[PDB]
Design a protein around this ligand. Structure first.
Ligand code: CA
Ligand code: CA
Ligand code: CA
Ligand code: CA
Ligand code: CA
Ligand code: CU
Length: 243
């Protein structure tokens, strides 16, 4: 499945959401370049004004297509996400906003022809109408995060739990605790990984010529946490080691 990702792959993202009865839809288009761990995506709220802050949806849309992560060669044996392709994987999360509501997301990530599709349903409940989310108190920016991946042998898939921190307008932070589970759609074999993490950097921007409510996302994702043999083979002073 890795061979499906050596070039630039078109991406489509479709989301329907209901957060405290505020219904919305988003369509995204992008390009994924796993050779460089690189994603470029543009999301448009097709229903009008998005009723939650754009940053709160980044992981759902993208930490949404982790098949575009760069797994270094020495780690490619641990790449569940590409191994599940083209048939795809289910990705489910609960995202719990501290002192506020939660999103539950269910997505299917798979190829449709040459295009990698992420189809999502999102349900949000227990939000405070004047809290950081429904009150639009989150800054339009995004921090770097590590996503630790573990095998879920029972389900022939993977799991992850990680904390996203969203900068708030008053200078504080809104924690969004993520629990994630992924399971393969195909009946074919998949790679079950050793423990490792995805180091993810995300930059949000806008096209000044776009009048609709939208977000541009530029993201780089690299698998890490397992040290290549090179360091000991060549005595390279940059890894953790002892004398
Ligand atoms: Ca392009
Ligand atoms: Ca092992
Ligand atoms: Ca040394
Ligand atoms: Ca070293
Ligand atoms: Ca040590
Ligand atoms: Cu670590």
């Amino acid at each position: 499945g890795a061979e499906l990702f050596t070039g630039v792959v078109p991406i489509l993202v479709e989301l329907d959401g209901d957060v405290n009865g505020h219904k919305f839809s988003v369509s995204g288009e992008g390009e994924g370049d796993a050779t460089y761990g690189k994603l470029t995506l543009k999301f448009i709220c097709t229903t009008g004004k998005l009723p939650v802050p754009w940053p709160t949806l980044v992981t759902t849309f993208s930490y949404g297509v982790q098949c575009f992560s760069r797994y270094p060669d020495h780690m490619k044996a641990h790449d569940f996400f590409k191994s599940a392709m083209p048939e795809g994987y289910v990705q489910e999360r609960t995202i719990s906003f501290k002192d506020d509501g939660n999103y539950k997301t269910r997505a299917e990530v798979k190829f449709e022809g040459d295009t990698l599709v992420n189809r999502i349903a999102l349900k949000g409940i227990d939000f405070k109408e004047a809290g950081n989310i429904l009150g639009h108190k989150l800054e339009y920016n995004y921090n770097s995060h590590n996503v630790y991946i573990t095998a879920d042998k029972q389900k022939n898939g993977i799991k992850a739990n990680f904390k996203i921190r969203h900068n708030i307008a008053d200078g504080s932070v809104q924690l969004a605790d993520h629990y994630q589970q992924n399971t393969p759609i195909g009946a074919g074999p998949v790679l079950l990984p050793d423990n490792h993490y995805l180091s993810t950097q995300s930059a949000l921007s806008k096209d000044p010529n776009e009048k609709r409510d939208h977000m541009v996302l530029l993201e780089f994702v690299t698998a890490a946490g397992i040290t290549h043999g090179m360091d000991e083979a060549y005595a390279l002073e940059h890894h953790h080691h002892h004398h």
